[PDB]
Amino acid sequence: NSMATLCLGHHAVPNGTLVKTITDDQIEVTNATELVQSSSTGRICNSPHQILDGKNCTLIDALLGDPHCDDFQNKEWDLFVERSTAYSNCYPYYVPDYATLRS
Amino acid sequence: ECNSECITPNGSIPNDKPFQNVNKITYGACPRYVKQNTLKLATGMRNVPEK
Amino acid sequence: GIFGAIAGFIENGWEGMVDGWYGFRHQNSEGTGQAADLKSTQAAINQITGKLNRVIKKTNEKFHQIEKEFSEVEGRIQDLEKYVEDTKIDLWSYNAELLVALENQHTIDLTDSEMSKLFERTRRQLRENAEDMGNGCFKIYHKCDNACIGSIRNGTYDHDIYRNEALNNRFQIK
Amino acid sequence: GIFGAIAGFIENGWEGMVDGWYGFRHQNSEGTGQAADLKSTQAAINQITGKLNRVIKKTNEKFHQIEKEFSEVEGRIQDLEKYVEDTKIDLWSYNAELLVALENQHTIDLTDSEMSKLFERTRRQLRENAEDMGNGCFKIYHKCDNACIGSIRNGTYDHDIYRNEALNNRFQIK
Amino acid sequence: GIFGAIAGFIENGWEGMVDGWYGFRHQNSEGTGQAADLKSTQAAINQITGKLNRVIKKTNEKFHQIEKEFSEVEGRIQDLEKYVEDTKIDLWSYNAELLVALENQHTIDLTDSEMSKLFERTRRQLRENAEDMGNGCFKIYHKCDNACIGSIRNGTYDHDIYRNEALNNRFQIK
Ligand SMILES: *[C@@H]1O[C@H](CO)[C@@H](O[C@@H]2O[C@H](CO)[C@@H](O[C@@H]3O[C@H](CO[C@H]4O[C@H](CO)[C@@H](O)[C@H](O)[C@@H]4O)[C@@H](O)[C@H](O[C@H]4O[C@H](CO)[C@@H](O)[C@H](O)[C@@H]4O)[C@@H]3O)[C@H](O)[C@H]2NC(C)=O)[C@H](O)[C@H]1NC(C)=O
Ligand SMILES: *[C@@H]1O[C@H](CO)[C@@H](O[C@@H]2O[C@H](CO)[C@@H](O[C@@H]3O[C@H](CO[C@H]4O[C@H](CO)[C@@H](O)[C@H](O)[C@@H]4O)[C@@H](O)[C@H](O[C@H]4O[C@H](CO)[C@@H](O)[C@H](O)[C@@H]4O)[C@@H]3O)[C@H](O)[C@H]2NC(C)=O)[C@H](O)[C@H]1NC(C)=O
Ligand SMILES: *[C@@H]1O[C@H](CO)[C@@H](O[C@@H]2O[C@H](CO)[C@@H](O)[C@H](O)[C@H]2NC(C)=O)[C@H](O)[C@H]1NC(C)=O
Ligand SMILES: *[C@@H]1O[C@H](CO)[C@@H](O[C@@H]2O[C@H](CO)[C@@H](O)[C@H](O)[C@H]2NC(C)=O)[C@H](O)[C@H]1NC(C)=O
Ligand SMILES: *[C@@H]1O[C@H](CO)[C@@H](O[C@@H]2O[C@H](CO)[C@@H](O)[C@H](O)[C@H]2NC(C)=O)[C@H](O)[C@H]1NC(C)=O
Ligand SMILES: *[C@@H]1O[C@H](CO)[C@@H](O)[C@H](O)[C@H]1NC(C)=O
């Protein structure tokens, strides 16, 4: 027949991912990547930042020297962790400007 | 015991993404807290299946 | 489609082309075949990898900030602490939302650019020896065996040695 | 014009075309006429409606925020409350300003895309039977009555049955 | 390159063309020459000057804001003052970073638009009297002296008076 034919094109995928653009709320592309970390383990990794578990002590009880917080004397942290289970067991006190001091 | 640069009240999270929806309260090398639960960034072309 | 090629004049994408993003599909006297174009494939990938790398980079460690949950009612100072944080979050959410939108539209459009860029490169390559059929395919007006097709792809196609035949085939009556 | 069609190679827009955005205007042995192309018209409209819908969506109810006007001098705590709000407003004004700019530039450019997309669709449709006159019009080298024109628009134009005539008309001397 | 012209099908930019941005370079029986195209040159410049002016405009005087460096530890009120300012700076840095990115990509792309716009303007101008060689040059199929070239640039080129010669030169055998 003294002829031939040549087609040009692009690929596709059986499945696809819907993404948002300027003009479209949903539009399908061959793939995409998720930019929002939406999930967690539920557990705090003890490295690399130095974690100090406050356990049954609050930071202020640990500061003042509440007897059940003797284990916290002269300790350091990158992050001090206060637990809801914490309590106080010493003389009744009031820290005006509590939040500032804790901070 | 594990290793993670970003800490929230909900546990540590991966900071390989740019945004996060775990908690507005964070510590360390964390993703930006946003309100969205998902943001798909297209890495391919317009997918036009055959049939 | 902005450049009007993907979902514009090309009807479908090739689900069976899994060795590249853009490519060639042909038919001649020696049968049919298909092979990817690694230039335009890699070009699209490079642009996308570039912006992907550029979006996905880390920020500064943030250390001791303000309280964002409050156990007691404090009024004015708390109102402000809440207001500041909320303001922040809305703005960052906005930026993210917009970023993705702009980026995605651009990705859609740059890949459409690469499609037409490939098509035009070929159209020029073939000079007067073939015609645009409208659907992203060319009609070749001369015998073009598998070796010939392999000179078009790979850009080693001298049109001048086929020119004579092609012109005679193009300009007849019916 | 980015795609170079509207205010680029097309001289004017058609103030008398009020049945569409893009369309055809012609002259032949049976007189002159005009009719809109609903495909490209609707395409531009869909894109714009999409982004319009996407811009114009509501936000969260906002309830008890901070005071933003003050009747007395309070110094440091007021200074901050004012500073926070002002900061916020500048950033939101910026976002708005930029949003409109980007969107508008894109709207200008996507409608220019649709113009060239239509033109190229037709240029391919007509194969070798007509020539690009430069101003957004084609010179048809064969008799093409109103019925013929109505096969070009509506994409039912088989070029092959006119090809013979057109080639003879295209390749003469003067 | 998005429009695929600069660093796409044009191999190099002309370091010796210092009288414009876009232009023409030619060879004929009377030798070689070069001259700039002031239309497309000025068009690119106008767009860029416009956005440049638009980016570079001043803001409001800002007067008595908050303290941003502190000589003493104050805790909660200072924590907030620091937090507000830091938040602000991150957001403004972001906006700036993004602005430049978008603008630069657009500038790259609009100048590529102007290149192809010029090329297409010429391709249409020349009708059937010349062929696209692929590298941003045209092959003229008729004698075209310096005066002739000076009618192509300057858009006073009537193709019809050369058409006859050109067709005969285009459609021979070898
Ligand atoms: C469709 O969309 C998907 C979504 O994932 C894309 O998938 C991604 O593809 C890229 C490219 O291959 C993957 O990137 C790879 O990540 C590996 C994991 O390394 C991580 O390790 C630690 C984990 O703590 C991090 O700190 C670190 O920064 C990395 O995040 C890397 O190992 C890879 O690099 C090297 O790995 C091999 C290992 O032998 C080396 O030999 C190579 O030289 C290579 O350079 C690589 O960077 C990415 O992980 C994929 N996503 C996911 C979720 O896994 C698709 O690419 C896209 N398209 C297709 C067709 O799927
Ligand atoms: C942080 O604070 C929490 C809460 O106060 C402490 O948890 C309690 O710790 C005490 C002291 O170690 C535990 O007391 C032990 O209780 C066992 C069960 O008895 C009662 O336990 C709970 C709490 O009262 C009741 O709800 C339950 O119904 C039982 O009636 C006893 O078996 C233990 O007896 C012996 O324990 C050891 C020897 O093994 C010695 O101390 C004595 O010989 C003692 O006789 C003891 O009485 C209590 O059980 C803990 N609570 C719970 C729910 O288990 C944490 O210890 C404290 N510190 C941290 C977490 O580091
Ligand atoms: C196309 O050009 C490339 C130049 O790299 C050639 O690629 C070779 O292809 C043959 C198969 O035909 C392989 O055996 C070689 O290993 C390839 N070489 C490289 C460096 O990739 C190819 O030969 C050219 N096309 C034709 C039809 O010969
Ligand atoms: C173009 O294609 C459309 C297919 O829908 C045809 O549209 C019809 O146009 C005629 C007028 O010529 C109307 O009477 C019909 O009601 C239209 N039908 C529909 C479904 O819209 C049209 O006939 C085609 N063009 C020509 C020249 O026949
Ligand atoms: C191109 O058109 C312009 C119209 O302005 C002409 O420009 C003149 O060029 C000549 C040199 O050939 C100068 O002497 C004149 O001063 C120019 N006039 C202006 C107003 O710029 C030019 O003549 C046209 N091209 C040719 C080949 O004649
Ligand atoms: C399947 O779709 C997912 C998105 O849900 C995508 O990440 C993946 O690349 C797709 N894989 C295939 C083989 O289509």
Author numbering:
A (entry chain A): 8 to 110
B (entry chain A): 276 to 326
C (entry chain B), D (entry chain B), E (entry chain B): 1 to 174
Manuscript text:
The trimeric HA protein is critical for facilitating virus entry and infection of host cells and is the major target of neutralizing antibodies. The HA can be divided functionally into three major regions: (1) the receptor-binding subdomain (RBS), (2) the vestigial esterase subdomain located lower down on the HA globular head, and (3) the membrane-proximal stem region that is responsible for the low pH-triggered membrane fusion activity of HA in endosomal compartments. Here, we describe the unique human mAb H3v-47 that mediates very broad neutralization of H3 influenza viruses by binding to an unusual conserved epitope on the side the H3 HA head domain. This antibody mediates inhibition of virus replication using multiple molecular mechanisms including inhibition of virus egress and mediation of ADCC activity.
To further investigate the antibody epitope, we determined the crystal structure of H3v-47 Fab in complex with H3N2 A/Minnesota/11/2010 (Minn2010/H3v) HA, at 3.57 Å resolution. One HA protomer with one Fab was present in the asymmetric unit. The Fab binds to the globular head of HA below the RBS, in a region near the vestigial esterase subdomain. The position of the binding region suggested that H3v-47 cannot block the sialic acid-binding pocket, which is consistent with the observation that H3v-47 does not exhibit HAI activity. A total area of 1061 Å2 is buried at the antibody-antigen interface (511 Å2 on HA and 550 Å2 on the Fab), where the heavy and light chains contribute to 61% and 39% of the Fab buried surface area, respectively. H3v-47 targets a unique conformational epitope spanning the RBS and vestigial esterase region in the HA head mainly using the complementarity determining regions (CDRs) H2 and H3 from the heavy chain and L1 and L3 from the light chain. A total of 23 residues from Minn2010/H3v HA participate in intermolecular contacts, making a total of 18 hydrogen bonds (H bonds)/salt bridges with both heavy and light chains, as well as 96 van der Waals (VDW) interactions. PheH54 from CDR H2 (a signature residue on CDR H2 of VH1-69–encoded germline antibodies), and ProH100a, ProH100d, and TyrH100f from CDR H3, mediate the hydrophobic interactions with the HA. For example, Lys82 in the antigenic site E makes one salt bridge by its side chain (Nζ) with AspH64 (Oε2), and eight VDW interactions with Gln61H and AspH64, mainly from its main chain. The structure of H3v-47 in complex with H3v HA revealed that a region close to previously defined antigenic site E, containing the natural variant E82K, is a key site of vulnerability.
